[PDB]
Design a protein around this ligand. Structure first.
Ligand SMILES: *[C@@H]1O[C@H](CO)[C@@H](O[C@@H]2O[C@H](CO)[C@@H](O[C@@H]3O[C@H](CO[C@H]4O[C@H](CO)[C@@H](O)[C@H](O[C@H]5O[C@H](CO)[C@@H](O)[C@H](O)[C@@H]5O[C@H]5O[C@H](CO)[C@@H](O)[C@H](O)[C@@H]5O)[C@@H]4O)[C@@H](O)[C@H](O[C@H]4O[C@H](CO)[C@@H](O)[C@H](O)[C@@H]4O)[C@@H]3O)[C@H](O)[C@H]2NC(C)=O)[C@H](O)[C@H]1NC(C)=O
Ligand SMILES: O=C(NC1CCCCC1)OC[C@@H]1C[C@@H]2CCN1C[C@@H]2C#CC#C[C@@H]1CN2CC[C@@H]1C[C@@H]2COC(=O)NC1CCCCC1
Ligand SMILES: [Ca+2]
Ligand code: NA
Ligand code: NA
Ligand SMILES: [Zn+2]
Length: 804
């Protein structure tokens, strides 16, 4: 019923309720604009730039923008008015000058924030397109910038833009792809279409809502595609001239480019130079406009992309029809990732287990890997949502998967795409922050886009809703307004047991050839059990236990552990391996040795009988016997308190890691400190399980089986200092290995471990923060480093990609 009028209402900030017609920046998308929207709100007469002959002109309300004398006071000049008509310079031509304080017009309560988001803007464009982007290159070199920013998985538009707005992983905000089926709604969601407009798809609390609830006004962030970029900028500039009580403090501009073109031409197509020139020109208009309003040293500007773009063509498509015979009983969400479910729920013959088996390592060159979603690398955080299908296909970069060849030619067209694993270099995108609140000429290390919501909240004095960022981890981007995080309080204190049990009290069915057994060396043994070498093996203090539980600290010559009396195994084991340390073998006579620990009761210990009786399950050790400091220290590594349950298929991975890789890293990094332990995440929510969530135990026992094993390997960033004598910043790499009864994930697994184990571990790289969530532990509690710096270390991901 669109018979009302947009007179005095163009780009109104609250949308009026149907069936009265709308004049907001979204009305075109709902086909609901008033009849005179175009005429009044979308003026194009005379274009977007003042020329010499328009200077001082008589206001003509029909023009797109104005060059008349009164346009400044009306706030609707063309962005280049002062340059063409008042002999002013373009913002880009001015030297940069540090903005030490905001320089805002009277009546501004805080520096406004403008988010300039660019679709498909790959990180390497900053260097490779630099010659054609002078405005963006100035923002970058004068402000604060990262070499790149990591998107979330899938590296698609919708999941990423909503992550930027909410600080949440897609699994938690609910936008888990560009397309989705929700079985509870029984409803679908598509990028094109009208179902995306329904609010039930959208979880968490995005920045515009956070702002409004806390009394900070927001511009409407979303723009109908047909509103030209120049008009989007002019609207933002007009809103910024509104009276104090109506003027928003936060705005977004959005560009469909360079993504639109990247799909057609590939990331580096020669056609790609023009779209980059044009985005830059848009940035130029914004900054020229701000400089006219005297706001160019007042506004914080963020220039931020959602994902990169990779070379992908028709001929690089794998087909599920070349693998499966029941192809018609499945529905595939296709392309740069795959999600598979049953075509129909009344068909009880469809079986996920046999689907995965049919797609596993079937061709020597296979360009995708099938996964049950709970087995995907935990760093992707891509499982805990009913909209994510049980079966997922991780697709190689540069490839697609499709169901049938017909789907690809009857449903080439494209040379670029994205969606791949968020560790892939081509998927990385950009971040620049410019303004009074950001640092001056400062480079910062790469970080994840989940972190930005907190910083945007900080920029606006807002308290962020609960999110997946680690607040404080990006304080180094900011001149001021930092948020001063504090360490979580330890919840459980440890017990420190001494010798309390005699060996004969234990009936564990365990045996060791150790009775083949002096106040020189017994005086030594006693010190080692009280913590005399603890300074060596626990470098950053004990991890804090952030939940209620019962555990013991156990000291040894070569290692220290936090032993859970509830889970019957360590929550963590800490040890340092110097560059000079030697690897030894496990002597023949000690092959099956397991020794009772006289500090811990029989009832709180594992037993060997359970393993003997459990045909599927074996056991491994957290501190490795291979790295013992001496033949006598080696007996400690065989304590029942150092033992953990491991599938034999997993033992192969773990033994190679402990025998070969630990020593390799100590060699390369000049010593390493290792913390290892189990993870239980049976409901795949990325958070430590309570005992009543455990779905598997060693047969006949109360010994819970971990879903994963982690290690955190820390050393000195300046590797001329040894790990145990480091004066400055730390360096860390970590992993969360899935504890699986087979090695089907590794197609090369029947070859020697030196050909596949390390590749598996790299796939399963993790942030310390991911391990924290999964264990309820807090690491690096006692260092000489600032807490903000430690938060940054905890969010670091070692990616094993070459250098961008
Ligand atoms: C990443 O960061 C987020 C945010 O901090 C973390 O997610 C939070 O996790 C906590 C702890 O588990 C959740 O607490 C539980 O809350 C529910 C009530 O939840 C409702 O209210 C909140 C608050 O407004 C909403 O955000 C919730 O929204 C969810 O559901 C709607 C659909 O209804 C949807 O629009 C959203 O996308 C969102 O979905 C996601 O979360 C749900 C689970 O909550 C999940 O099923 C889904 O797959 C999505 O991932 C919602 O409207 C409450 O019922 C629970 O109490 C129960 O457990 C207690 C034990 O304490 C029992 O005593 C009791 O009997 C209850 O059964 C929880 O307290 C919180 O909801 C959640 N927030 C969000 C936004 O997801 C992640 O954990 C972080 N991830 C990592 C890896 O760290
Ligand atoms: O133009 C912009 N600017 C961006 C700047 C950077 C931040 C995000 C937006 O984006 C281009 C958009 C993004 C999406 C993909 C491509 N293209 C169309 C798509 C869509 C849509 C779209 C839409 C409409 C706008 N609001 C409201 C109406 C629908 C749905 C949506 C979501 O609204 C709530 O989130 N409210 C809820 C959320 C949870 C709290 C309670 C209220
Ligand atoms: Ca869990
Ligand atoms: Na034995
Ligand atoms: Na066994
Ligand atoms: Zn795209």
């Amino acid at each position: 019923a669109t018979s009302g009028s947009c007179k005095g209402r163009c780009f109104e900030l609250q949308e009026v309720g149907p069936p009265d017609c709308r004049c907001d920046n979204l009305c075109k998308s709902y086909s609901s604009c008033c009849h005179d929207f175009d005429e009044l709100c979308l003026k194009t007469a005379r274009g977007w730039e003042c020329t010499k002959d328009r200077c001082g002109e008589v206001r003509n309300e029909e023009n797109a923008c104005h060059c008349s004398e009164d346009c400044l006071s009306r706030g609707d000049c063309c962005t280049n008015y002062q340059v063409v008509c008042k002999g002013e310079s373009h913002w880009v031509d001015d030297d940069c000058e540090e903005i030490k304080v905001p320089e805002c017009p009277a009546g501004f309560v805080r520096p406004p924030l403008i988010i300039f988001s660019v679709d498909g803007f790959r990180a390497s464009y900053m260097k490779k397109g630099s010659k054609v982007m002078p405005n963006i290159e100035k923002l970058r070199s004068c402000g604060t910038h990262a070499p790149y920013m990591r998107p979330v998985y899938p590296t698609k538009t919708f999941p990423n833009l909503y992550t930027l707005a909410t600080g949440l992983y897609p699994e938690s905000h609910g936008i888990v792809g560009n397309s989705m089926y929700d079985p509870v709604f029984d409803a679908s969601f598509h990028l094109r279409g009208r179902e995306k407009f329904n609010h039930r798809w959208w979880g968490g609390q995005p920045l515009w809502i956070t702002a409004t609830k806390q009394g900070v006004r927001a511009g409407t962030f979303f723009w109908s595609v047909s509103i030209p970029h120049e008009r989007r900028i002019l609207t933002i500039l007009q809103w910024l001239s509104l009276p104090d009580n109506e003027r928003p403090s936060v705005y977004a501009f959005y560009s469909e480019q360079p993504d639109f073109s990247g799909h057609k031409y590939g990331p580096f197509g020669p056609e790609m130079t023009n779209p980059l020139r044009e985005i830059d020109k848009t940035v130029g208009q914004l900054m020229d406009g701000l400089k006219q309003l005297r706001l160019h040293r007042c506004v914080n500007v963020i220039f931020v992309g959602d994902h990169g773009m990779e070379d992908v063509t028709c001929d690089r498509t794998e087909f599920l029809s070349n693998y499966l015979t029941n192809v018609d009983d499945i529905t595939l969400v296709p392309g740069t990732l795959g999600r598979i479910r049953a075509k129909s729920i009344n068909n009880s013959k469809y079986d996920p287990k046999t689907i995965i088996a049919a797609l596993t390592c079937k061709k020597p060159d296979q360009h995708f890997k099938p996964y049950m979603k709970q087995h995907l690398p935990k760093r992707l955080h891509y499982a805990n949502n009913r909209r994510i299908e049980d079966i997922h296909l991780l697709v190689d970069r540069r490839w697609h998967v499709a169901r049938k060849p017909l789907d690809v030619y009857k449903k080439c067209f494209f040379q670029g795409d994205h969606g791949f694993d968020n560790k892939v270099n081509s998927m990385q995108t950009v971040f620049v922050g410019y303004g009074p609140t950001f640092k001056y000429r400062t480079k910062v290390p790469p970080f994840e886009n989940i972190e930005l919501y907190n910083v945007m909240c900080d920029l606006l004095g807002l308290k962020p809703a609960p999110n997946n960022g680690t607040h404080g981890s990006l304080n180094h981007l900011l001149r001021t307004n930092t948020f001063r995080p504090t360490m979580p309080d330890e919840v459980s204190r440890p017990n420190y047991p001494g010798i309390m049990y005699l060996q004969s009290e234990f009936d564990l069915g365990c045996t060791c050839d150790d009775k083949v057994e002096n106040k020189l060396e017994e005086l030594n043994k006693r010190l080692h059990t009280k913590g005399s070498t603890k300074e060596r093996h626990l470098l950053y203090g004990r991890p804090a236990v952030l939940y209620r539980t019962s555990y013991d600290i156990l000291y040894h010559t070569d290692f220290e552990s936090g032993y859970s009396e509830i889970f019957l195994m360590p929550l963590w084991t800490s040890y340092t391996i110097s560059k000079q340390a030697e690897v030894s073998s496990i002597p023949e006579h000690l092959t099956n040795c397991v020794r009772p620990d006289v500090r811990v009761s029989p009832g709180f210990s594992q037993n060997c009988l359970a393993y003997k009786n459990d045909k599927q399950m074996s056991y491994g050790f957290l501190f490795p016997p291979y790295l013992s400091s001496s033949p006598e220290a080696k007996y400690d590594a065989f304590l029942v308190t150092n033992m953990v349950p491991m599938y034999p298929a997993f033992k192969r991975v773990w033994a190679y890691f402990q025998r070969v890789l630990v020593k390799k890293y100590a060699s390369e990094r000049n010593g390493v400190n290792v913390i290892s332990g189990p993870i239980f995440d049976y409901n795949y929510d990325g958070l430590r399980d309570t005992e009543d969530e455990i779905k598997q135990y060693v047969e006949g026992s109360s010994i819970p089986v971990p879903t994963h094993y982690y290690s955190i390997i820390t050393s000195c960033l300046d590797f001329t200092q040894p790990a145990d004598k480091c004066d400055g910043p730390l360096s860390v790499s970590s992993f969360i290995l899935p504890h699986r009864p087979d090695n089907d994930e590794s197609c090369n697994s029947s070859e020697d471990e030196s050909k596949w184990v390390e590749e598996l571990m790299k796939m399963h790289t993790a942030r310390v923060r991911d391990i924290e969530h999964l264990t309820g532990l807090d690491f690096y509690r006692k260092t000489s480093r600032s807490y903000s710096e430690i938060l940054t270390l905890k969010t670091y991901l070692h990616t094993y990609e070459s250098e961008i």
